[PDB]
Amino acid sequence: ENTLTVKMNDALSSGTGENIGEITVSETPYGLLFTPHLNGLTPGIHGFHVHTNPSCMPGMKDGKEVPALMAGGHLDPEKTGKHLGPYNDKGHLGDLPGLVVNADGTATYPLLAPRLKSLSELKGHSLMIHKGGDNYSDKPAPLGGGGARFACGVIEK
Amino acid sequence: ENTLTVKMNDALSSGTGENIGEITVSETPYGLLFTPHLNGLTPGIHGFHVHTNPSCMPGMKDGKEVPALMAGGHLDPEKTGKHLGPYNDKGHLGDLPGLVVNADGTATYPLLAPRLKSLSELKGHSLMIHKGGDNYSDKPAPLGGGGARFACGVIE
Ligand SMILES: [Cu+2]
Ligand SMILES: [Cu+2]
Ligand SMILES: [Zn+2]
Ligand SMILES: [Zn+2]
């Protein structure tokens, strides 16, 4: 393909929740462009990453159900172990720019991830929108401060 | 490392208004990164572009003083005459990603312009923040719908 469309749903401790739209991913000469067509989100910047597993299912951790835990960690085929954002090749390949949410809860602003070059790199993985933001660092909080997983979609094929 | 710090000031019909912070420009392997440290803006997305002239002063047009008119138009060394945004090399080279302003009126979210590669490409030009947004197209409104010029900073 030259584009793909990822449906995004809210992540619940019990499974999958409300559909909040889709994200269209296209290839550009500068990398992958993520153009959201979403609603249902808190205004501001949200952590936004490709995660390793093609699942948005919840999982148990320290006694409690965690929404979208089965998506696994940030996509990291080079096993860097480091959350350094979309502009640093020393960290997770799955680190995308923060998702920008408008005051009415829609997300429309397009996001360029220059380190990703082909839609093939997304196949068999998941897209994640977090409750918190992303300062592209593991300091002062791990994983950019994204925290909990709010919405999720699977890229199959 | 080599970075530029561009002070940004409100643009008024009578001249230059109050400072609203600065934008730090850095070079990355993927292009220039504009990291804003601004305040005093309306929440939302603002048209954000490099303009040709190293001035932010106002000027008269069709009988009215226009804020920051002296910056000229969008930087366009290839004379494309088209506004197509930061990801499309068929339009103005000066087209940057829209400036993201938080609910409290501050701008902190960093913006990558992949088509710009060296800080030297910004010397002798200006950075412009518009009142309106930017849909990276000349339709439905020309120049992405940025409209009037709200704040501006000279580089060199
Ligand atoms: Cu994530
Ligand atoms: Cu402009
Ligand atoms: Zn990461
Ligand atoms: Zn333009």
UniProtKB/Swiss-Prot annotation, chain A:
It comes from the Bacteria. It is found in: Periplasm. GO terms for cellular component: periplasmic space. SUPFAM superfamilies: Cu,Zn superoxide dismutase-like. Disulfide bonds join 56-152. Its cofactor is Cu cation; Zn(2+). Cu cation binds at residues 49, 51, 74, 130. One of its GO terms (molecular function) is superoxide dismutase activity. Pfam families: Sod_Cu (PF00080). It catalyses: 2 superoxide + 2 H(+) = H2O2 + O2. Coiled coil: none annotated. Transmembrane segments: none annotated. Its EC number is 1.15.1.1. Gene3D superfamilies: Superoxide dismutase, copper/zinc binding domain. Its main location: periplasm. Monomer. NCBIfam families: PRK10290.1. Encoded by a cryptic bacteriophage. Destroys radicals which are normally produced within the cells and which are toxic to biological systems. Belongs to the Cu-Zn superoxide dismutase family. This is Superoxide dismutase [Cu-Zn] 1. The gene is sodC1.
UniProtKB/Swiss-Prot annotation, chain B:
Keywords: Antioxidant, Copper, Disulfide bond, Metal-binding, Oxidoreductase, Periplasm, Signal, Zinc. Its cofactor is Cu cation; Zn(2+). Binds 1 copper ion per subunit. GO terms for cellular component: periplasmic space. Cu cation binds at residues 49, 51, 74, 130. CDD domains: Cu-Zn_Superoxide_Dismutase. Zn(2+) binds at residues 74, 83, 92, 95. InterPro entries: SOD-like_Cu/Zn_dom_sf (IPR036423), SOD_Cu/Zn_/chaperone (IPR024134), SOD_Cu/Zn_BS (IPR018152), SOD_Cu_Zn_dom (IPR001424). Its main location: periplasm. Belongs to the Cu-Zn superoxide dismutase family. This is Superoxide dismutase [Cu-Zn] 1. It comes from Salmonella typhimurium (strain 4/74).
